Structure 1
């Protein structure tokens, strides 16, 4: 398995039609996972499954600019499961990141950070065994 937290460079930044695929297995009794598409110190797109936020499972998405988190976007569809293998696919579209988990569409996140070419790394962290992290053009 790859060492978590893992940094996946995205050479030249992201572009529409770029597909990022992450395979891993959630740890037993997981608490949290995060994907962080980063523009330097800023987080263009934070995708954060929370397994126990006041006894609810929720995905929180947000952007961090100059160390400040913005408005959260929340999704109660929660496709992750402690102990089980998952696939996350993040497709960059012109106006949003489009996320599918286990081949089912989950959410879209409109681009707040609009310099897509400057979003040139992806951090993967939290309560997973990480099998692979890669990208391709579709």
Structure 2
């Protein structure tokens, strides 16, 4: 087990064909999870499953610049289940982050923050038991 919130350093930032893998288990009756790919205090990519927003499950993605959230991108396809082990894979591509959960494509999120090599931290928070967070090149 890893303690949540957890910070995974991304030395020298991210780059296309870098794959970040997060393994854990959703807590029973979870409410929220977040991944925050950070450039200093800015959040280049916030990936935020919400288990009960007006009695619906939704994935909210966004960017935070100078402490201001931007336009949300929302996905109703929701692959997480309370109590179950999950794998989130975030693949950095030239124009977007691509996310797959449990080996099924979920979403893409276009790069708003363009200094990829300065996105040097991944924060992992919320209602999970975290087992592993790592990266490799494909």
- TM-score range normalised by the length of the shorter chain: over 0.9
1:109 Cα offset (Å): 0.2
1:35 Cα offset (Å): 0.1
Residues 50-90 of structure 1 deviation map (CA, whole Å, 9 limit, x = unaligned): 00000000000000000000000000000000000000000
1:15 Cα offset (Å): 0.2
1:122 Cα offset (Å): 0.2
Which residue does the alignment assign to 1:67?
67
1:108 Cα offset (Å): 0.2
Structure 1 runs of 4+ aligned residues shifted over 4 Å read none
1:105 Cα offset (Å): 0.1
CA distance in 2, matches of 1:115, 1:105: 25
CA distance in 1, matches of 2:43, 2:26: 23
CA distance in 2, matches of 1:12, 1:118: 6
1:12 Cα offset (Å): 0.3
Which residue does the alignment assign to 1:91?
91
1:10 Cα offset (Å): 0.2
The yes-or-no answer on 1:131 pairing with 2:131 is yes
Unaligned runs of 5+ in 2: none
1:112 Cα offset (Å): 0.1
Give TM-score scaled by structure 1 length: 1.00
CA distance in 2, matches of 1:86, 1:103: 10
1:117 Cα offset (Å): 0.4
Give the aligned length. 138
Which residue does the alignment assign to 2:48?
48
Q: Secondary structure at the match of 2:106?
A: strand
Q: CA RMSD, aligned part only?
A: 0.3
Q: Secondary structure at the match of 1:90?
A: strand
